[PDB]
Swiss-Prot record, chain A:
This is Proprotein convertase subtilisin/kexin type 9. Monomer. Can self-associate to form dimers and higher multimers which may have increased LDLR degrading activity. The precursor protein but not the mature protein may form multimers. Interacts with APOB, VLDLR, LRP8/APOER2 and BACE1. The full-length immature form (pro-PCSK9) interacts with SCNN1A, SCNN1B and SCNN1G. The pro-PCSK9 form (via C-terminal domain) interacts with LDLR. Interacts (via the C-terminal domain) with ANXA2 (via repeat Annexin 1); the interaction inhibits the degradation of LDLR. Residues 17-89 form the Inhibitor I9 domain. The gene is PCSK9. Cleavage by furin and PCSK5 generates a truncated inactive protein that is unable to induce LDLR degradation. It is found in: Cytoplasm; Secreted; Endosome; Lysosome. Expressed in neuro-epithelioma, colon carcinoma, hepatic and pancreatic cell lines, and in Schwann cells. It comes from the Eukaryota. It is linked to Hypercholesterolemia, familial, 3: A form of hypercholesterolemia, a disorder of lipoprotein metabolism characterized by elevated serum low-density lipoprotein (LDL) cholesterol levels, which result in excess deposition of cholesterol in tissues and leads to xanthelasma, xanthomas, accelerated atherosclerosis and increased risk of premature coronary heart disease. FHCL3 inheritance is autosomal dominant. The C-terminal domain (CRD) is essential for the LDLR-binding and degrading activities.
């Protein structure tokens, strides 16, 4: 059910950094456990990952620095609503 | 003298804080005389590596919003969060962290109404729009720049988030700002326009220096200053109420719509922001909402009103005229406007009329085909606010009339303090218009049942487009 999204403006994409968005009523404790489970699964496969930030207050989820190869795996994690590749914003 | 932009937002009659304005931009020169002592730099940094110059953009916007001499809301309290680097570049992730920081600050130390200015843009982002929805649902007002790409604002974020206030840029001649090859963004995602060309404001070069800047960032800063003033005067305003007031008090039909691409002319609001005439009885506020194009598909388009708004009427439009009309229908105990495409039709737009009508539980009265189809609002204190019509086959006061082969839908509202009148106007032409008189609000706009492309309300004017043709307008006012 989880979907993947990346910026439609190719020069604005920042691959390697993903925002993992969890289901609406997910708790901060569950978000943290989902991030650690992802890091554990990634390690068992030989990939280095970095949890840059865990979100709470607005949307549940976290920010991860990792190879795109883990996206299929990350989409299978519990509570995942969608994943979005990071992208650039500019002063208007 | 007085900067042109400050004079432009000054109403034709004028009687001339508890609100904080958060700015998400570059670093700022907090000691500039225009803003000194009124700007709190959080020093929260979430900027990507760079692949006076650094504070240029942010300092100028803090000045536009609250500056002592050239500001919109003179003296307003401001908080800045750095999310853009020295080249004015940031990330969706860094923007999300800043927005989250605002919610967390507010949870730890509540204050009064909050206005968040986001003078930045990236491509359409699901997560950025969802974050804006959650911040708005938490009771925060978000004002954003439509973008400087001379493109449809719907393809950009936060510009496209339904719950924000998206601001386009206009110049001294009330024309859309051109930024060289590019310029202001436009379309159905823009709420209104504001001065965004040659805007004098604080320059980071020195503490008393001033620079003129242009863009949708400057335009959005004007609206955050207006919103902050409106919220200081009426602090109980919800977001729906504040958006309706900005649209009501705007200068209408001053923009030459010929500057916008053909298909964007109808969808783009012809409004230039202005301060209200007084701080301030009860008036009926309505606005038009255009849906996304259905597609070429049996294709349908859906237009809905924001939370706290009532949908009073529903119309549809097709450039080719290949449509099957529209219907108003209940969904989650709320009226929605659904438009239908026809065989070989490129697609349709659903156009809703959204109004602030508290405790009015606007219902639909539907009659399928059976003299012409008829339905009526027969209840004490009930007014007819709109008529819709749809056909499932190609090719009197308080009463709706439709074609013999079409279903008719009437929006009936419980509003005893409301007086409504139906004003019809037919000419023996590519466009027929009819306007509600001054002091009356257009609640509904339709074509009387040779071939119509569609109907849509433009402020208080009903517009019917054809390939006798009669434009029918329902006008209401507080009695
Ligand atoms: C992505 O589409 C829009 C984006 C933006 C807007 C309207 C949009 O037009 C629809 C159409 C249908 C629907 C819908 O059916 O949900 C939502 C927005 C405005 C003009 C604000 C607005 O009126 N917001 C609204 N929220 C709720 C209903 S209207 N400026 C912000 C960006």
């Amino acid at each position: 059910t989880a979907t993947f999204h990346r910026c439609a403006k190719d020069p604005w994409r920042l691959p390697g950094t993903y925002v993992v968005v969890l289901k609406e009523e997910t708790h901060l404790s569950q978000s943290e456990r989902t991030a650690r489970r992802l890091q554990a699964q990634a390690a068992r496969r030989g990939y280095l990952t970095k949890i840059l930030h865990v979100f709470h207050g607005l949307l549940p989820g976290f920010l991860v620095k990792m190879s795109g190869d883990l996206l299929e795996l990350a989409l299978k994690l519990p509570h995942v609503d969608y994943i979005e590749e990071d992208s650039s914003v500019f002063a208007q």
